[model samples]
Each structure stands twice: as structure tokens, then as C-alpha cells.
Target: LSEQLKHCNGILKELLSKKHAAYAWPFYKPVDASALGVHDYHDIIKHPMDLSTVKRKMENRDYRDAQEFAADVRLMFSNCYKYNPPDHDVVAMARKLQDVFEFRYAKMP
Candidate 1:
């Protein structure tokens, strides 16, 4: 089981490394609602998530299985959709990452 988790964490790290695109800049860290002036962010995204947070959880071994890790990854993208407009560039970037993640995750053993 530990080995399986190790593999999953490795996969997560791989995805993290892919966050180098300019469009992905917004998702690299937690959203600072106050600094961004989006006061209603907390009210909108009840369970806000980000790649950095997911990486931290992976390091802490907070995920019990690959499914849990995948859920957090999906959550980050879903949160982007929830807060940003459908036509927004960030939403488009999230969609691209979402597709890429699913493609890679499907290959997990």
C-alpha cells in the first residue's frame, strides 16, 4: 500500500512539474482573496484548493489512495471554473490542465 501511494505521489509530482506555462501562473499557489480583491471567493469556493496545497498534502501523506489524490487535483480545476467566467483565459487554462491530468492519471497502475 505504501508503495502504491509512493507511485501516486510520484505521478502528482510529475503533474506539478507541468505547471510551468504562463497561463498556469494563477494556480501555482493558494488564492489570496483579500489581495486579489475577490472578497466573495471564500463564500463561493467553500473548499478552495491549489496545486501547492495538493503538493503539501502529498508530502504529508494525507491521501489514502490514488483516488483521493485525484479528487484534490480535480477540485483545483473545478474551483477555477466556479470562480472564473466560462470565457476567461484562466478557465481555458484549467480545462487544458484538466484534460492533461485525466490523460495521465488513466495510465496509473
Candidate 2:
């Protein structure tokens, strides 16, 4: 895998490790920003930049963790959109992280 995939995967694993199974249940479904008429991935993710403050109650324990997870999601999406995978391994890895938000936090009902 390329360095980017490796880094993203590592970040993913760490994020998972920090949350409980219950907390992770929300991460299993696909993200549907289109429902809100938003087509841009970056805009969708960054839209909550101000809302992050609501997390202040848990920030002391999870702020950095949350930030890293957000960063990884953004980077993964950006890289996938910007480059075509030339190798099978790279493609697979990129695909895995491509919809990371959906995979990691869209399952909550």
C-alpha cells in the first residue's frame, strides 16, 4: 500500500479503538450529503466546523482524536478524488478509505 493508505488505515484503527461498539454502530451506513443538496465532499465534512464546539464536554479526552479522524477522512477523500490508482493494492486501499465517514460513522439511527 502507498504511504497515504497506510497512514489512513492506521488512523482508522486508532479511531475505532477509542470508541465503543455502540458508538461505532453509526459508522456503518453510507453518507448521503446529496439528500441535503450538497455535492461537494469537502463542504459536507467541513460544514460542521463550528459544531465541533459542542464536543467541548468531551474534548479534553477526545478532541485530538476527533480532529485526527476528521483529517484522515478529508485527506483520504481528497487523495482518491485527485489521483487514479495505478496499482491494485493502492486501489483497494484507497477504496477502503474513500468513504471513510460512511464506513466509520453513518450507521447511527
Task: Please report the candidate that would top TM-score against the real structure.
Answer: 1
lDDT of 1 by residue, 1-109 (tens): 4766777777667666745455566777999999999999999999999889988888887989888988998999999999999999889888887787788788777
Worst 10 residues of 2 by lDDT: 48-57
Q: How does candidate 1 score on lDDT?
A: 0.82
Clash statistics: count for each candidate? 0, 6
Would you list the clashing residue pairs of candidate 1? none
After TM-score superposition, what is the CA distance of residue 34 in candidate 2 from its true location, in Å?
Answer: 38
TM-score of each: 0.88, 0.29
The per-residue C-alpha lDDT of model 2 at residue 21 equals 33
Model 1 segments more than 4 A misplaced:
1-3
Candidate 2 Cα errors over 4 Å, as ranges: 1-11, 14-68, 86-88, 99-101
Which residue pairs collide in model 2, if any?
A: 26-106, 26-107, 26-108, 27-104, 27-105, 27-106
